[PDB]
Amino acid sequence: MEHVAFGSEDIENTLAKMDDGQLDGLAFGAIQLDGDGNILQYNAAQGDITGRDPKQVIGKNFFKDVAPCTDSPEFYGKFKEGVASGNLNTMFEYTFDYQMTPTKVKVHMKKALSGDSYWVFVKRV
Ligand SMILES: *C(=O)/C=C\c1ccc(O)cc1
């Protein structure tokens, strides 16, 4: 149980110190992507939400392979703009409905600290 609150301002700084193990101790879903949409990290809680096996999707493209329902201007378009601009910090509600019971969630997308990495944070609403 790692104590970090969804939406926290210096969230990117706190999560820089964590590893795959410690990521699994978060109260919310966490996904780390590269600039092309590929999945680098995927924690235990996210799996709990989507039914995905954390390890089986690392390496896959989130927008093309794993989450086609986010391939839209409302999700993917926002991501591509932040990557192009090098800045991204947006929160919105979204429905996940691919191969799963339609699930309303809150998404927080933010640029990570390191190189070309981006966080996708998810909790139930
Ligand atoms: C739509 O396809 C939305 C979300 C989503 C996120 C993660 C995984 O693994 C599947 C689907």
PDB file of all heavy atoms in Angstrom, residues 99-119:
ATOM      1  N   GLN A  99     -14.063  -5.440 -25.030  1.00  0.00           N
ATOM      2  CA  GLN A  99     -13.941  -6.795 -24.510  1.00  0.00           C
ATOM      3  C   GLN A  99     -14.259  -6.842 -23.021  1.00  0.00           C
ATOM      4  O   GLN A  99     -13.856  -7.766 -22.312  1.00  0.00           O
ATOM      5  CB  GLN A  99     -12.535  -7.349 -24.751  1.00  0.00           C
ATOM      6  CG  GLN A  99     -11.927  -6.996 -26.095  1.00  0.00           C
ATOM      7  CD  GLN A  99     -11.034  -8.097 -26.638  1.00  0.00           C
ATOM      8  OE1 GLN A  99     -10.141  -8.589 -25.944  1.00  0.00           O
ATOM      9  NE2 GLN A  99     -11.271  -8.486 -27.885  1.00  0.00           N
ATOM     10  N   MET A 100     -14.984  -5.846 -22.516  1.00  0.00           N
ATOM     11  CA  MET A 100     -15.204  -5.777 -21.074  1.00  0.00           C
ATOM     12  C   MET A 100     -16.526  -5.107 -20.738  1.00  0.00           C
ATOM     13  O   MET A 100     -17.115  -4.411 -21.565  1.00  0.00           O
ATOM     14  CB  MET A 100     -14.056  -5.001 -20.413  1.00  0.00           C
ATOM     15  CG  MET A 100     -13.795  -3.644 -21.051  1.00  0.00           C
ATOM     16  SD  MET A 100     -12.597  -2.615 -20.189  1.00  0.00           S
ATOM     17  CE  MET A 100     -13.299  -2.543 -18.546  1.00  0.00           C
ATOM     18  N   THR A 101     -17.002  -5.313 -19.512  1.00  0.00           N
ATOM     19  CA  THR A 101     -18.202  -4.568 -19.122  1.00  0.00           C
ATOM     20  C   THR A 101     -17.869  -3.079 -19.179  1.00  0.00           C
ATOM     21  O   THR A 101     -16.851  -2.681 -18.606  1.00  0.00           O
ATOM     22  CB  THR A 101     -18.704  -4.929 -17.719  1.00  0.00           C
ATOM     23  OG1 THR A 101     -19.272  -6.244 -17.734  1.00  0.00           O
ATOM     24  CG2 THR A 101     -19.811  -3.975 -17.289  1.00  0.00           C
ATOM     25  N   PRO A 102     -18.693  -2.312 -19.876  1.00  0.00           N
ATOM     26  CA  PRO A 102     -18.502  -0.856 -19.947  1.00  0.00           C
ATOM     27  C   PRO A 102     -18.284  -0.284 -18.551  1.00  0.00           C
ATOM     28  O   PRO A 102     -19.106  -0.418 -17.653  1.00  0.00           O
ATOM     29  CB  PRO A 102     -19.809  -0.372 -20.570  1.00  0.00           C
ATOM     30  CG  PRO A 102     -20.220  -1.520 -21.438  1.00  0.00           C
ATOM     31  CD  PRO A 102     -19.850  -2.759 -20.664  1.00  0.00           C
ATOM     32  N   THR A 103     -17.126   0.343 -18.369  1.00  0.00           N
ATOM     33  CA  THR A 103     -16.702   0.812 -17.056  1.00  0.00           C
ATOM     34  C   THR A 103     -16.338   2.292 -17.107  1.00  0.00           C
ATOM     35  O   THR A 103     -15.419   2.700 -17.816  1.00  0.00           O
ATOM     36  CB  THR A 103     -15.509  -0.006 -16.527  1.00  0.00           C
ATOM     37  OG1 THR A 103     -15.889  -1.382 -16.371  1.00  0.00           O
ATOM     38  CG2 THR A 103     -15.096   0.459 -15.139  1.00  0.00           C
ATOM     39  N   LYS A 104     -17.080   3.086 -16.339  1.00  0.00           N
ATOM     40  CA  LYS A 104     -16.797   4.513 -16.269  1.00  0.00           C
ATOM     41  C   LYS A 104     -15.611   4.744 -15.339  1.00  0.00           C
ATOM     42  O   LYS A 104     -15.524   4.234 -14.224  1.00  0.00           O
ATOM     43  CB  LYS A 104     -18.007   5.323 -15.816  1.00  0.00           C
ATOM     44  CG  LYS A 104     -17.986   6.769 -16.289  1.00  0.00           C
ATOM     45  CD  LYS A 104     -19.265   7.497 -15.904  1.00  0.00           C
ATOM     46  CE  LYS A 104     -20.380   7.232 -16.902  1.00  0.00           C
ATOM     47  NZ  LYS A 104     -21.246   6.094 -16.475  1.00  0.00           N
ATOM     48  N   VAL A 105     -14.661   5.522 -15.838  1.00  0.00           N
ATOM     49  CA  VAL A 105     -13.473   5.828 -15.059  1.00  0.00           C
ATOM     50  C   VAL A 105     -13.109   7.302 -15.200  1.00  0.00           C
ATOM     51  O   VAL A 105     -13.645   7.991 -16.063  1.00  0.00           O
ATOM     52  CB  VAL A 105     -12.273   4.976 -15.506  1.00  0.00           C
ATOM     53  CG1 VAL A 105     -12.558   3.499 -15.309  1.00  0.00           C
ATOM     54  CG2 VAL A 105     -11.945   5.303 -16.957  1.00  0.00           C
ATOM     55  N   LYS A 106     -12.198   7.718 -14.335  1.00  0.00           N
ATOM     56  CA  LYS A 106     -11.547   9.012 -14.397  1.00  0.00           C
ATOM     57  C   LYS A 106     -10.106   8.790 -14.865  1.00  0.00           C
ATOM     58  O   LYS A 106      -9.397   7.976 -14.278  1.00  0.00           O
ATOM     59  CB  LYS A 106     -11.556   9.740 -13.059  1.00  0.00           C
ATOM     60  CG  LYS A 106     -11.206  11.216 -13.150  1.00  0.00           C
ATOM     61  CD  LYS A 106     -11.929  12.041 -12.101  1.00  0.00           C
ATOM     62  CE  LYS A 106     -13.323  12.435 -12.563  1.00  0.00           C
ATOM     63  NZ  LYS A 106     -13.830  13.629 -11.821  1.00  0.00           N
ATOM     64  N   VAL A 107      -9.726   9.518 -15.911  1.00  0.00           N
ATOM     65  CA  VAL A 107      -8.372   9.399 -16.426  1.00  0.00           C
ATOM     66  C   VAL A 107      -7.574  10.683 -16.201  1.00  0.00           C
ATOM     67  O   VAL A 107      -8.072  11.774 -16.473  1.00  0.00           O
ATOM     68  CB  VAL A 107      -8.338   9.086 -17.934  1.00  0.00           C
ATOM     69  CG1 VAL A 107      -6.897   9.007 -18.416  1.00  0.00           C
ATOM     70  CG2 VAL A 107      -9.079   7.794 -18.228  1.00  0.00           C
ATOM     71  N   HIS A 108      -6.351  10.504 -15.726  1.00  0.00           N
ATOM     72  CA  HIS A 108      -5.381  11.565 -15.549  1.00  0.00           C
ATOM     73  C   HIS A 108      -4.134  11.255 -16.379  1.00  0.00           C
ATOM     74  O   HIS A 108      -3.427  10.292 -16.101  1.00  0.00           O
ATOM     75  CB  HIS A 108      -4.971  11.756 -14.090  1.00  0.00           C
ATOM     76  CG  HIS A 108      -4.038  12.915 -13.910  1.00  0.00           C
ATOM     77  ND1 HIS A 108      -3.139  12.993 -12.874  1.00  0.00           N
ATOM     78  CD2 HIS A 108      -3.869  14.044 -14.636  1.00  0.00           C
ATOM     79  CE1 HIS A 108      -2.458  14.121 -12.966  1.00  0.00           C
ATOM     80  NE2 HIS A 108      -2.879  14.774 -14.029  1.00  0.00           N
ATOM     81  N   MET A 109      -3.904  12.072 -17.393  1.00  0.00           N
ATOM     82  CA  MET A 109      -2.727  11.915 -18.243  1.00  0.00           C
ATOM     83  C   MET A 109      -1.700  13.000 -17.947  1.00  0.00           C
ATOM     84  O   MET A 109      -2.018  14.191 -17.963  1.00  0.00           O
ATOM     85  CB  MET A 109      -3.132  11.956 -19.714  1.00  0.00           C
ATOM     86  CG  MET A 109      -3.545  10.604 -20.275  1.00  0.00           C
ATOM     87  SD  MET A 109      -3.501  10.589 -22.081  1.00  0.00           S
ATOM     88  CE  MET A 109      -4.397  12.101 -22.432  1.00  0.00           C
ATOM     89  N   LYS A 110      -0.458  12.607 -17.678  1.00  0.00           N
ATOM     90  CA  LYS A 110       0.561  13.610 -17.384  1.00  0.00           C
ATOM     91  C   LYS A 110       1.944  13.170 -17.847  1.00  0.00           C
ATOM     92  O   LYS A 110       2.328  12.007 -17.743  1.00  0.00           O
ATOM     93  CB  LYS A 110       0.580  13.927 -15.883  1.00  0.00           C
ATOM     94  CG  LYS A 110       1.536  15.056 -15.532  1.00  0.00           C
ATOM     95  CD  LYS A 110       1.035  15.891 -14.366  1.00  0.00           C
ATOM     96  CE  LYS A 110       2.127  16.821 -13.857  1.00  0.00           C
ATOM     97  NZ  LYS A 110       1.805  17.361 -12.507  1.00  0.00           N
ATOM     98  N   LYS A 111       2.718  14.124 -18.357  1.00  0.00           N
ATOM     99  CA  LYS A 111       4.096  13.861 -18.753  1.00  0.00           C
ATOM    100  C   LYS A 111       4.908  13.332 -17.580  1.00  0.00           C
ATOM    101  O   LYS A 111       4.836  13.810 -16.447  1.00  0.00           O
ATOM    102  CB  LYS A 111       4.733  15.137 -19.306  1.00  0.00           C
ATOM    103  CG  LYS A 111       5.888  14.923 -20.268  1.00  0.00           C
ATOM    104  CD  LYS A 111       6.635  16.226 -20.519  1.00  0.00           C
ATOM    105  CE  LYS A 111       8.039  15.967 -21.039  1.00  0.00           C
ATOM    106  NZ  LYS A 111       8.034  15.431 -22.432  1.00  0.00           N
ATOM    107  N   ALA A 112       5.719  12.302 -17.828  1.00  0.00           N
ATOM    108  CA  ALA A 112       6.556  11.817 -16.729  1.00  0.00           C
ATOM    109  C   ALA A 112       7.759  12.743 -16.571  1.00  0.00           C
ATOM    110  O   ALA A 112       7.893  13.740 -17.285  1.00  0.00           O
ATOM    111  CB  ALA A 112       6.983  10.380 -16.960  1.00  0.00           C
ATOM    112  N   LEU A 113       8.634  12.413 -15.630  1.00  0.00           N
ATOM    113  CA  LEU A 113       9.835  13.204 -15.401  1.00  0.00           C
ATOM    114  C   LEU A 113      10.917  12.863 -16.421  1.00  0.00           C
ATOM    115  O   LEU A 113      11.401  13.729 -17.151  1.00  0.00           O
ATOM    116  CB  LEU A 113      10.356  12.978 -13.979  1.00  0.00           C
ATOM    117  CG  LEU A 113      10.952  14.202 -13.279  1.00  0.00           C
ATOM    118  CD1 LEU A 113      12.376  14.456 -13.753  1.00  0.00           C
ATOM    119  CD2 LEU A 113      10.079  15.426 -13.512  1.00  0.00           C
ATOM    120  N   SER A 114      11.288  11.589 -16.467  1.00  0.00           N
ATOM    121  CA  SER A 114      12.326  11.101 -17.362  1.00  0.00           C
ATOM    122  C   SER A 114      12.051  11.459 -18.820  1.00  0.00           C
ATOM    123  O   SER A 114      11.152  12.236 -19.139  1.00  0.00           O
ATOM    124  CB  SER A 114      12.476   9.582 -17.225  1.00  0.00           C
ATOM    125  OG  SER A 114      13.792   9.234 -16.827  1.00  0.00           O
ATOM    126  N   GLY A 115      12.850  10.872 -19.700  1.00  0.00           N
ATOM    127  CA  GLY A 115      12.837  11.078 -21.121  1.00  0.00           C
ATOM    128  C   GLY A 115      11.476  11.261 -21.752  1.00  0.00           C
ATOM    129  O   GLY A 115      10.724  12.170 -21.397  1.00  0.00           O
ATOM    130  N   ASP A 116      11.155  10.396 -22.711  1.00  0.00           N
ATOM    131  CA  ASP A 116       9.904  10.474 -23.453  1.00  0.00           C
ATOM    132  C   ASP A 116       8.882   9.468 -22.937  1.00  0.00           C
ATOM    133  O   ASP A 116       8.480   8.522 -23.616  1.00  0.00           O
ATOM    134  CB  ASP A 116      10.163  10.253 -24.945  1.00  0.00           C
ATOM    135  CG  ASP A 116       9.141  10.965 -25.816  1.00  0.00           C
ATOM    136  OD1 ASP A 116       8.008  10.440 -25.952  1.00  0.00           O
ATOM    137  OD2 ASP A 116       9.472  12.046 -26.361  1.00  0.00           O
ATOM    138  N   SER A 117       8.447   9.679 -21.699  1.00  0.00           N
ATOM    139  CA  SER A 117       7.458   8.792 -21.093  1.00  0.00           C
ATOM    140  C   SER A 117       6.281   9.609 -20.566  1.00  0.00           C
ATOM    141  O   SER A 117       6.411  10.773 -20.184  1.00  0.00           O
ATOM    142  CB  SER A 117       8.078   7.943 -19.987  1.00  0.00           C
ATOM    143  OG  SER A 117       8.254   8.697 -18.799  1.00  0.00           O
ATOM    144  N   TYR A 118       5.115   8.981 -20.581  1.00  0.00           N
ATOM    145  CA  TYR A 118       3.853   9.605 -20.218  1.00  0.00           C
ATOM    146  C   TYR A 118       3.031   8.679 -19.325  1.00  0.00           C
ATOM    147  O   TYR A 118       2.971   7.478 -19.586  1.00  0.00           O
ATOM    148  CB  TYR A 118       3.060   9.974 -21.479  1.00  0.00           C
ATOM    149  CG  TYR A 118       3.858  10.843 -22.425  1.00  0.00           C
ATOM    150  CD1 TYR A 118       4.695  10.277 -23.380  1.00  0.00           C
ATOM    151  CD2 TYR A 118       3.783  12.228 -22.354  1.00  0.00           C
ATOM    152  CE1 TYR A 118       5.430  11.067 -24.244  1.00  0.00           C
ATOM    153  CE2 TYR A 118       4.512  13.024 -23.216  1.00  0.00           C
ATOM    154  CZ  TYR A 118       5.333  12.440 -24.157  1.00  0.00           C
ATOM    155  OH  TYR A 118       6.062  13.233 -25.015  1.00  0.00           O
ATOM    156  N   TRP A 119       2.418   9.238 -18.291  1.00  0.00           N
ATOM    157  CA  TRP A 119       1.574   8.480 -17.392  1.00  0.00           C
ATOM    158  C   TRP A 119       0.089   8.573 -17.757  1.00  0.00           C
ATOM    159  O   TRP A 119      -0.418   9.644 -18.066  1.00  0.00           O
ATOM    160  CB  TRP A 119       1.700   8.971 -15.944  1.00  0.00           C
ATOM    161  CG  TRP A 119       3.011   8.661 -15.300  1.00  0.00           C
ATOM    162  CD1 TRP A 119       3.998   9.561 -15.002  1.00  0.00           C
ATOM    163  CD2 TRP A 119       3.494   7.382 -14.874  1.00  0.00           C
ATOM    164  NE1 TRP A 119       5.062   8.921 -14.417  1.00  0.00           N
ATOM    165  CE2 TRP A 119       4.777   7.582 -14.326  1.00  0.00           C
ATOM    166  CE3 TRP A 119       2.959   6.088 -14.903  1.00  0.00           C
ATOM    167  CZ2 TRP A 119       5.539   6.535 -13.811  1.00  0.00           C
ATOM    168  CZ3 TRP A 119       3.719   5.056 -14.393  1.00  0.00           C
ATOM    169  CH2 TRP A 119       4.991   5.283 -13.855  1.00  0.00           C
TER     170      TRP A 119
END
